[PDB]
């Protein structure tokens, strides 16, 4: 029912645009980078009602105890890349590990999220992300916010790998 995911990414990469397409179903051209917020859609994956609460990772770099305690709360994460920035593919491993540590956990469930999949200015290859997907252990995804493409699937992925990790 209640699946906690986090769409961690560096900035600009369209966290907030991937948040508001699932939930609204429309490309948001202009959601303020210093908004850090959550969002609920209540969908039915595999015959499962799911209450996705979704968190969009998107202010200041700031390490709290708080802050620690409320990923730590987080189930699921979107680790969340553009495919016409090359840093954004860089800073992947640092969100992975900030993961690790918050949930004391070597298994944590994620999706890795080559967004922006519609632009022409490709930075980091298909072959990169998959290599950085498995080594990993988990599924990459090329998503566009723009057009939705792969949107569905990348939450829906995540949450169907949260569903393997409980059976474990
Ligand atoms: C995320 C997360 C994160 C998790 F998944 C899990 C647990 C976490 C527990 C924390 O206590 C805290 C976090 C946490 N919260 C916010 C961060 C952040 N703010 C700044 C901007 C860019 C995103 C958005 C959010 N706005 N930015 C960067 O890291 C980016 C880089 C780029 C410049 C220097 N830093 C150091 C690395 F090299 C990479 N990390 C952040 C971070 F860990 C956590
Ligand atoms: N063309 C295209 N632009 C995108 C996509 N996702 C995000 N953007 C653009 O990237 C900019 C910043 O994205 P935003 O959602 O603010 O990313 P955040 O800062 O990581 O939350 C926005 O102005 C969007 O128009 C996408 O899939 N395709
Ligand atoms: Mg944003």
Redesign the pocket.
Known sequence: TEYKL?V????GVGKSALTIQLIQNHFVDEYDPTI?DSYRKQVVIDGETCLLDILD????????AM??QY?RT?EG?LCVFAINNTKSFE?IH??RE??K??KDSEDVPMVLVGNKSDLPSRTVDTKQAQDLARSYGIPFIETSAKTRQGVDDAFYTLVREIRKHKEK
Do not use: K
Request: cysteine-free.
């Open positions: 986090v961690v990414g560096a900035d850090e990772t998107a202010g200041q770099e700031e390490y709290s802050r620690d990923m987080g994460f800073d640092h969100y900030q993961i540590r918050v």
